Amino acid sequence: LYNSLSKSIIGNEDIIKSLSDAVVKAATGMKDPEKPIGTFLFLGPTGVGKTELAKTLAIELFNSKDNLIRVNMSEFTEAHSVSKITGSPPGYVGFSDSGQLTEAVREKPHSVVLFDELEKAHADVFKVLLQILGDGYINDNHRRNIDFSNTIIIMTSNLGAELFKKKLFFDADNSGTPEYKRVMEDVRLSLIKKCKKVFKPEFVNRIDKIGVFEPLNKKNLHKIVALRFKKLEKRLEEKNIQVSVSEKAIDYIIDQSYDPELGARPTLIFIESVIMTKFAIMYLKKELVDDMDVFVDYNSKAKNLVINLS
Amino acid sequence: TLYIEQFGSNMNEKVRNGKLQGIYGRDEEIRAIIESLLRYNKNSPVLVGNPGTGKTTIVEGLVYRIEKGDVPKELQGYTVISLNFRKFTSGTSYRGEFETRMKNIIKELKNKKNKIILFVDEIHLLLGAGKAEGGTDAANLLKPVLSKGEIKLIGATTIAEYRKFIESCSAFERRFEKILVEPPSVDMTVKILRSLKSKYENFYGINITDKALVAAAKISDRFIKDRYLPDKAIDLLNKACSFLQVQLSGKPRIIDVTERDIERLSYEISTLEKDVDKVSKKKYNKLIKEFEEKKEQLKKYYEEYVITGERLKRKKEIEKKLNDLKELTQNYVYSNKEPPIELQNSLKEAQQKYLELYKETVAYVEAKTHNAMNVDAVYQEHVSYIYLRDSGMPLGSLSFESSKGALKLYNSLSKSIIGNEDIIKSLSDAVVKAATGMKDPEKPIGTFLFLGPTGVGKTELAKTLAIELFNSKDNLIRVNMSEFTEAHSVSKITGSPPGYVGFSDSGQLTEAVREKPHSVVLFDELEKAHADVFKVLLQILGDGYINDNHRRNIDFSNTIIIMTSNLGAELFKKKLFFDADNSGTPEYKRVMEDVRLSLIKKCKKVFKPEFVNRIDKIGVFEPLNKKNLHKIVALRFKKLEKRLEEKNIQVSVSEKAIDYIIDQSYDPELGARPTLIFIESVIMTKFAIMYLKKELVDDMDVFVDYNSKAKNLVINLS
Amino acid sequence: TLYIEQFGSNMNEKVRNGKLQGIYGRDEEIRAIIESLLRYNKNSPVLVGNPGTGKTTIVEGLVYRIEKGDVPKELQGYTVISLNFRKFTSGTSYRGEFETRMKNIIKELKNKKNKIILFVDEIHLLLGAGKAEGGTDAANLLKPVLSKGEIKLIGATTIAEYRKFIESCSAFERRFEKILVEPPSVDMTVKILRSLKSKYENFYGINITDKALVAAAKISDRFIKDRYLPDKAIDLLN
Amino acid sequence: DVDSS
Ligand SMILES: Nc1ncnc2c1ncn2[C@@H]1O[C@H](COP(=O)(O)OP(=O)(O)OP(O)(O)=S)[C@@H](O)[C@H]1O
């Protein structure tokens, strides 16, 4: 797992060293009997890969995208949104199913449970979540016991990002030295102290490992763009259009649209809105055979060019 | 012979007759049943799974392995019988009769010499059967004897039926073993469709390209969420093969539509001409021109039916002769020679002639998109046609003219929308991602944000878009974001959670998207909305997977997300933008880009920074110049004719008369509204009062022209 | 002569009698049913759509095309039966009568020598029929058959009834095929109303000016939002 | 200036 995740995502190897090691307890079977395997709480700036760690666990631990249970925490901002989890109590509408979450966990008892945007919720959903992280013992409408054992629980939230020591570590950290790295420990401790004041300090007791994502470096983001072009034939596999890209053209994509505060979502849009759209408008007019060898290359004359072969 | 054999049906005989021939391998699922049947205690598995995943096809596949002998010999020779309730419950009329029906069934199943393993279709129906006023349930009779091992049983229920009906009687559960039928994991479903090709090629007679087989998997599975995988992937080929039989045994679809329409338009000529000459002269002369030109389109259509008819038969001629002489001439390869002269003379043309006829078809499919005439081959364009029809895109826009209208979008948008040309290229390119099929899955197309001062036409780009991309006003799913000032109004989006009023309906925004998955969604004013509403949409911009009251996934793929919002009313300068916009300078280019960089910074404060990166293109509309507003006023008079079609009063205006309308009410601080107030409250009045008093006959053309002397407008009436 | 004619009313006799005479059919709509009426497995389209938007009109337009012959040569001669839920409740004397009532129907549906095709008015219903204390779910009696093509069937319900009842089962839903009926996009409704003059002129003795027809549509379009469109333009003319 | 011309 530690080699598979590093090929799939270019994240912090510290979080992966903790995440993959918790999975080792599942295969050995030496683990907490009534506590879930590897509770986590991911933090960092927007745009960095807090969810796709939890998304590739559906791809590697289970090889099934539907086995991920993406619970969108953002729809729980109303205080009475507790009743989607445990279901409606008896005498009301919707008592037949156990709930929107608990019927899903009973259907697939081995899943990475994903809580995207944990911050964007009322404090009442936090109250039920204390049961799930401490025990498997959440109860249903009919008081069916559930086992959240054998289920990794990964929640992510956006807190920080104003506390996260802005431009000093975004704009100036284009290289990772021990001089820059001493800041991250000082920010990580203030993130945990911020987690006490909003996330009700007993949550920190259940969470096994509070990972914190660093913002993407230019050397870090250079590998991520190479992964997107490897995924770019996956939408073109039905069309059989191979798209290889030289490294210097990848450097032109980064240097034109690097935004370290935004987690390099502008780099991903710059692919989808410029080089993908030119791949898209060239397919409309009759310049693309269904089999075309495509090699993007930067000619060092302030112009990208797309080399085509049949 | 046996007493249960007339009840239901014998599944084993249908495998012998070939009705149930063949199954694809789900061998880990199949062997789990055989081991449960060989257990000491209960011998009753239940196939729990999703409704579409082929739970019965395991058992339909299990009987094929019994009679052909692919079982261990301890299970060799058993016969399998189904039990429908149409035959099972017919004897429940008299009071002590159904128990005698149950008694003889147990007496045959307990026999070891009678080698029968029983199958029922849905066990949750069997619980409520035979409940007479003096009699027990059929399930409660089976409970003491299903614990005993001699009664072999196989059954299948769906998960929602198993949690509601079996779990209500927990003692009935423990007699049964779960074996989870799983969804078939799309990369395996491609191998399922390739296994089934020869069965469809015999029933339909239609060649199926492997291009369509992958398109029957990836387009069916990832784009539709209910009706789990093989009930989607097999279904489109079930519709692809049915679609081409009607175009072969009958006429092709274009000729079928046009022949019906010309018979109807000729009926309308009989309606208008008999009436008195009036306002209907204009529509009658419109329909006569429509009647002839559509009739002349037939003459090239029949030509296309004959030419592709010649292309189809000429390909069919070589498939009869040389395709069979290629294959059957495989005999005596060893020594009586397989490669001498004349054996290859015909093999040489089999690559030349057949592939040239192949490329004439493929070029004809990309030209005539979904309605290719005389084509025996299924294609991706046929599979997408069925997907686009059942998903609900309206019949005359943007996909039925595939890969041809996406180029013409930017030209068409300008007439509807003159100004602000840079943003319109991004709206055009987003559809270019849609029309080609090249886009990110689970990412919504075109998450645009439209900032600007009032009246620069921010929602106009969106009102005209549904008229342009879809030719339907109803596809513009507008939601009034200005309604969401309250924090507690969030539940209008996703709906009320269970245990509250209105759970039976879903969210008011999301219930329309299930009805119209191909739609251009609005959000009218994110400027005036509470921050908790932004928490919920945050989901819709990064993923399409917003959830409902019932946690049904919603497809916000193929949904353009236009979000107009203001973030102005200060910060867009009263003297460096509004008043100075007429003087065309490159000094525009350090002031517009300057004020834009604060607006994205403003989105970090009022909105969240998670909106700053997920929004694709933050367009900022330029305040209106004279030259653009000269044509925006000219548009209104084009729209004024549409309001006057019922009265047949054509309206026209000179360009000098437009300028006086501009010079009286030009305020860039508003822009384009007080000009229309000057049109609709001043010029429109004498279009109105000259009708009440009889200065306007119903057939009068009007040409407004500025006098440029007497200083007053003149109204030219003919 | 059919047993099913006793309970389901026969749509095919109305076009021969002239109860319906000429239908402004929706050409791209009706042929989707014919393509669903030939199928290896499903053979059961349903007309999901709106309360006032012509659901019966498509199937009355289908029988007008079958009885005259415009359909492909496979589907020629097929009989269409509109079921009457007033006549399904006539059974169930004490117990087991409805199973005699059900088995006699399905046996004629299995015969290809019988040309019969069911048309349910609303599959909103069929879930409550035959459910007594010992009842066994009339809709679930159809479940072992509908996977195979033994029953040709047409349905027509609204979207709200499709969501509140048909999706509640989730296994009864998968056999049916949604064929989305759309509101007819005003320009066609003028072509609808002009095809409806000759019946309305003779029924009233009253001439209808064509200027009133576009006035009957356009006033009905925007100025009344609910009660979807073909209910409005037909009634405000009528 | 109403002109019928
Ligand atoms: N360390 C990383 N390794 C690999 N891909 C990454 C990494 N960081 C970011 N990405 C990519 O950037 C995007 C990150 O998506 P996510 O940030 O996980 O979505 P998200 O976590 O909900 O974002 P936020 O922070 O909550 S707004 C995806 O396209 C990833 O592939």
Ligand SMILES: Nc1ncnc2c1ncn2[C@@H]1O[C@H](COP(=O)(O)OP(=O)(O)OP(O)(O)=S)[C@@H](O)[C@H]1O
């Ligand atoms: N592996 C497969 N091989 C062949 N046909 C399959 C396979 N999986 C599914 N099908 C087809 O898809 C349908 C699956 O049937 P089922 O899911 O069993 O529905 P069912 O038979 O009505 O039982 P229910 O409705 O699920 S309780 C049938 O029409 C099969 O022909």
Ligand SMILES: Nc1ncnc2c1ncn2[C@@H]1O[C@H](COP(=O)(O)OP(=O)(O)OP(O)(O)=S)[C@@H](O)[C@H]1O
């Ligand atoms: N570029 C344009 N093309 C066509 N019509 C336009 C344009 N700009 C403005 N208009 C017209 O001016 C009005 C613009 O309406 P809108 O501004 O879109 O309403 P709105 O977008 O909610 O306005 P704001 O900016 O939010 S206060 C309509 O009457 C349009 O016809």
Ligand SMILES: Nc1ncnc2c1ncn2[C@@H]1O[C@H](COP(=O)(O)OP(=O)(O)OP(O)(O)=S)[C@@H](O)[C@H]1O
């Ligand atoms: N295209 C058309 N051609 C002829 N008549 C039509 C057409 N559209 C609508 N009508 C008439 O308008 C009425 C509309 O019928 P429907 O909308 O099908 O209502 P219904 O038949 O009661 O089914 P519901 O209530 O919508 S589930 C019919 O009685 C038709 O006579």
